[PDB]
Amino acid sequence: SRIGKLLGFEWTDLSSWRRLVTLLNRPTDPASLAVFRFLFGFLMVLDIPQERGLSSLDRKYLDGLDVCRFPLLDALRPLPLDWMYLVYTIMFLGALGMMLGLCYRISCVLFLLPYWYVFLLDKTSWNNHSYLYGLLAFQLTFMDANHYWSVDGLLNAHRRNAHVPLWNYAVLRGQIFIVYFIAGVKKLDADWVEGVVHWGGLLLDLSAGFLLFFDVSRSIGLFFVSYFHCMNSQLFSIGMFSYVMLASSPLFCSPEWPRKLVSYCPRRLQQLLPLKAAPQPSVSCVYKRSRGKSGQKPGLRHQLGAAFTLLYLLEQLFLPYSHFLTQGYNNWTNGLYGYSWDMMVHSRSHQHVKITYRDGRTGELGYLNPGVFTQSRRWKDHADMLKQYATCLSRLLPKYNVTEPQIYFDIWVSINDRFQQRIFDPRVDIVQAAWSPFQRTSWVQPLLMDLSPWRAKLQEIKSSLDNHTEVVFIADFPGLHLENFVSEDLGNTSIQLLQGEVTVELVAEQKNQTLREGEKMQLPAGEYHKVYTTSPSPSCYMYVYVNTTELALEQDLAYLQELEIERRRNTPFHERFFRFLLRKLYVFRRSFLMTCISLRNLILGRPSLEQLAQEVTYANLRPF
Ligand SMILES: CC(C)CCC[C@@H](C)[C@H]1CC[C@H]2[C@@H]3CC=C4C[C@@H](OC(=O)CCC(=O)O)CC[C@]4(C)[C@H]3CC[C@]12C
Ligand SMILES: *[C@@H]1O[C@H](CO)[C@@H](O[C@@H]2O[C@H](CO)[C@@H](O)[C@H](O)[C@H]2NC(C)=O)[C@H](O)[C@H]1NC(C)=O
Ligand SMILES: CC(C)CCC[C@@H](C)[C@H]1CC[C@H]2[C@@H]3CC=C4C[C@@H](O)CC[C@]4(C)[C@H]3CC[C@]12C
Ligand SMILES: *[C@@H]1O[C@H](CO)[C@@H](O)[C@H](O)[C@H]1NC(C)=O
Ligand SMILES: *[C@@H]1O[C@H](CO)[C@@H](O)[C@H](O)[C@H]1NC(C)=O
């Protein structure tokens, strides 16, 4: 039958629940699962010092510092520094136990728990791959993969070579197909709707997933996917996300490829590892008992092992489209980067920030430099992060001779490069403003992306644009006002008005000249620019200027005209690889000695400050 070979499960198998559980729980060779678990454990062991930030844990979770934090849950406070150098060692032990196999369930739990404790602790450190590693660890906890090529096999008589159910491979393949197919779909929806190499990746996503499943296509599919994933390294700073998929692909091959690979390619010894004759029947595998009397009755380890696949794959498919349920996290474009399998927005051009505060006792105004406390910049363009920042400042300022201060932000984003628009309302007090994950926020100003004839003049002017100038479009809301002191280098500055009316004011001659729909006004340099909007509709400006003195100074340069990358490129790959190995050894050893110091502390007594300083200096010491 065509269904018999293509789509290996027979069509009549999908007839009842009791047939489905039998279909999912059927014996299969565990050879591939062992290799995948080994490589995943190896990679998770390797990346912990570098990417998860064990080398730079002292500089981030210091003691005696005052820093605002951005946790997913506001009650999930971090542990002290010397009780946080230990959870990473617990995580490392769990990952090593994953890799080898010793106490596989315990090692899986010991790696799972701290990873999801330190992942839901900084919303500014969520990537697309960290979520994937967490999901893979969560899957591998429940699926037994020590049945072949494991140390735990040599200390037991039931895991040397056994039969795993099929739903392990089913869940792994389904999860990776979802990863390959959801990203491709999101690449389509985003690109041509909000509006080469772009189409190549999209077609690769969808075609690679689909063809990699269906039988004859594996060789070409493996070639193409492997080429793409190997080339994506040294082109994106994604980390080890490429290597996880380069090792997640040979799980779409027949589940016996290691056994067929060892056979040929002759050798002198193939008997040190257990000789591959045949697996052994397992306990958790529904077998075809004699139909004369009755069939096997599956237990809880089969029915639950079948229902978990469905209840997990459906939820995984539903989650990346759960945007409409979490609305408070939704800024203009990207709400809670992470569980989306799509790329972020590159912070547009955030520019000017004007945090100001008023004291609740003396009623005095004060200015704060942007980002005085925090360690990240992502708190700026987010409604869920700005509230946390304001609340942290409200908590901490009363220790600086203030009391219940009221804070106002003025964030002038640039959506692409020429649409300066107030993303956050100046007039609202962020500390006492209501906020909820589901209910829509009230102080985020609605987008005015086009909302104007700004996409016509945009071109109608470039034909008439002279030499070295600059034109900026600014959209303003009703009931607010603006200010921008102009320098002493921009000449012929002028404003053209598109929607509504403006009340341009100069503080020097004290002029309050209003404008109607269409009026050219020449404004001087080095003066105030108090522009007010009185119309109920948002306005639009045509701020145009030319550096008239730039032509004068560039003529002087033209008058005179009439009057270690190379070293690193010439050098071959040997010394570059040597430098890579040296820096990796340095970071690994720094992590190891710092962890050893923190482990000695709070286990024994803490020694004197002199020894602490000496050993800290010793750890910093760069080798050669
Ligand atoms: C005499 C006193 C000062 C002892 C100090 C010795 C340190 C310099 C040693 C102790 C622990 C060593 C580390 C122990 C374990 C590893 C794991 C090892 O991991 C691998 O990546 C090797 C396997 C692979 O290539 O995948 C790399 C070397 C490293 C960082 C070692 C580097 C050198 C360290 C820090
Ligand atoms: C120029 O005219 C504008 C009116 O558009 C004045 O703006 C007003 O300023 C007062 C100050 O207390 C506010 O109460 C009003 O609400 C503002 N009106 C608007 C429409 O925003 C501005 O003060 C004038 N300039 C000077 C120097 O007096
Ligand atoms: C040590 C403390 C913080 C306990 C941490 C354990 C809890 C918070 C962690 C452990 C494993 C985690 C789960 C791992 C995988 C998934 C699947 C994903 O699609 C939704 C979130 C969800 C369901 C996680 C929710 C949080 C979770 C349950
Ligand atoms: C104030 O903040 C700015 C931007 O975050 C920073 O560059 C500057 O160093 C801060 N001021 C001081 C005194 O550090
Ligand atoms: C200023 O320069 C612009 C350049 O496009 C020109 O159109 C305008 O006439 C100039 N104005 C004055 C007053 O020189």
UniProtKB/Swiss-Prot annotation:
Name of the top EC class for this enzyme: lyase
Cytoplasmic topological segments: 104-105, 256-303
Single GO term (MF): gamma-glutamyl carboxylase activity
TM region(s), chain numbering: 30-50, 83-103, 106-126, 235-255, 304-324
Effect recorded for H229A: No effect on activity
Residues in compartment: Lumenal: 51-82, 127-234, 325-624
EC number(s) from the headed UniProt entry: 4.1.1.90
Family statement drawn from the similarity comment of this UniProt entry: Belongs to the vitamin K-dependent gamma-carboxylase family.
Matching PANTHER family: VITAMIN K-DEPENDENT GAMMA-CARBOXYLASE
Protein name: Vitamin K-dependent gamma-carboxylase
Species the sequence originates in: Homo sapiens
Taxonomic lineage from the root: Eukaryota, Metazoa, Chordata, Craniata, Vertebrata
